[PDB]
């Protein structure tokens, strides 16, 4: 079913879904490389208690690339330069009880664009659902820990201060990579990112990197000042 | 081994193979979006009985379609400039007994072109095969029901005048899909449809749709009048 | 790690590595289908008595295509038009002795091009490892039977002479191949083979063929008298 299109407003009204869906499609004229700072929001809301958010104001080109990682990846045609599908469970659609809904929301557009959003809902019904999370590297700090036990995916802000980023495995090693190790580790899982409308085809983005966290429990990064690095990890858990 | 080559003519001798083959390697020198209305048919003869037909004229795009669903996509070449290998057994080749051998001809084709037909055999030999059936909606009716119980893929005509399309799956649930929604469910399993000869991938022919079902019971198709629309269906069974 | 960058000169130092390593990065500014001469060989020196070699003057683009094969494919960058991932243990990493080492060379490369190597290490060791081995027809060679139990990979050079090819299973039956239909048999499995810098994909290189040997005993090979016919192929063992 059809959620709603957007044109000429730089923001979208707060969407209600009543009806259980299970994935989304985000349409667009700009194609994947072009988008700057569209964010999106998405949380279940229950009528008596407190809500439960999957998404608060992440980037739209982190939450397309956490979603299409591994066989797919994110398509085009003729009239929408900018097609992604982006799965909110695990094997079925939300159970909703009596009186959750689904609230989904669109922040920084740009006027002169068009925006399109789809749901998707399959016979199935799950309570497992996916939970996106942010994490921060400061400006002026040369080397920072963070902990990303339990999430299996993140998507990192890649920078030319980076220098090293050492791994820590569930057994206690420790090991050391560079930039280009990482990108070359990374797309040697998922080759291609993306399909272009002409027919080309591009291996992954020139400023954000994915990294599948399997196995590791700690990430060092060793840096130089001048800049923030930003993390978006994703973890699956029960509600 | 190769079975035969066609040109000048419009209608293929009818070819014999005593051999047992385990698949057909179909090339010829025009690109999958220009075939137009080849048709191919396929059957086993048998010495005393009656015939077992797999493939009874059916569309030479839907065929090659029905087949290289997946990991695998039409590849080109210097020389062809269109190769599909298209399997007739489970996991092995035709167990021919005492008296029988395939037959297989190529109908409506055109006077300046070329194809080429090529056999596969394997070591292993198996009872059960693919056999494809077709069915239609007719230019005039508004709402049809389709039976697609035991079927694992389906081939839609990809007309505009489709509108609504309805799945009913076997625990009883109904959904109800637009042709985008059906498109990209589509593409998120098998996004390569065919790789050209210059280089460019073509995600999906313009004018065929591939469905996968999987659990799935029955359709019921929605649309308005202008044009007839066709299901090319395969399945797997023991003979 | 950078291990080396060698450019200028037409062969390089013996270079040595002391950490365990896992895998190679070869990255260079050459196309994957403009290498013609280079080499690479690789050996460790046991503390213990007797040494191991895993590639012995290996051509550099049979050695890339013997460890790029399946999902994953050799890519490309804005700087280095070739970048490859060439795994030298099963799931670990080559595990050494106190004062052990792997030496690695280059020879027959180009004064005007650039060539960089990069060292994986990973927090699993191994004793399995990888070997690289040559084998040959000759000029005045009607036909040669190759055993290849215990392989699993090999890269044929193509050249007109050949006329068939048989493999004979580990059931005892034997099945005779065309160079068409094992070049047809190869690209079902393994769609793509690089991914070019513009955009642009290619499907396999035009004088080499990347043959998958699973459950195959034995090769036949025939072909008309006056060239040598070459194949590199690959096994995998515990030292």
Redesign the interface.
Known sequence: ??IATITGVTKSPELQVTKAIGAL?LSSDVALSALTTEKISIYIERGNGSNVILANKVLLKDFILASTYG???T?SDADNAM?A?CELADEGSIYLADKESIKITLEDLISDKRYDL?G????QQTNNLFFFEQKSVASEEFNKKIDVQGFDLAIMTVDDSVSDLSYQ?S?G?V??Y?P??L???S???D??QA??S??????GL?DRLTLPLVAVVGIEINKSQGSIINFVVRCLKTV
Request: a negative charge.
């Open positions: 079913m059809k499609i066989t797919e990846n398509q097609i599908l789809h998707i809902e399959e016979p495995y057994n090693q090991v050391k560079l280009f190790e990108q070359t580790l797309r040697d899982i080759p291609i399909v272009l002409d027919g080309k085809v591009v291996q020139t």
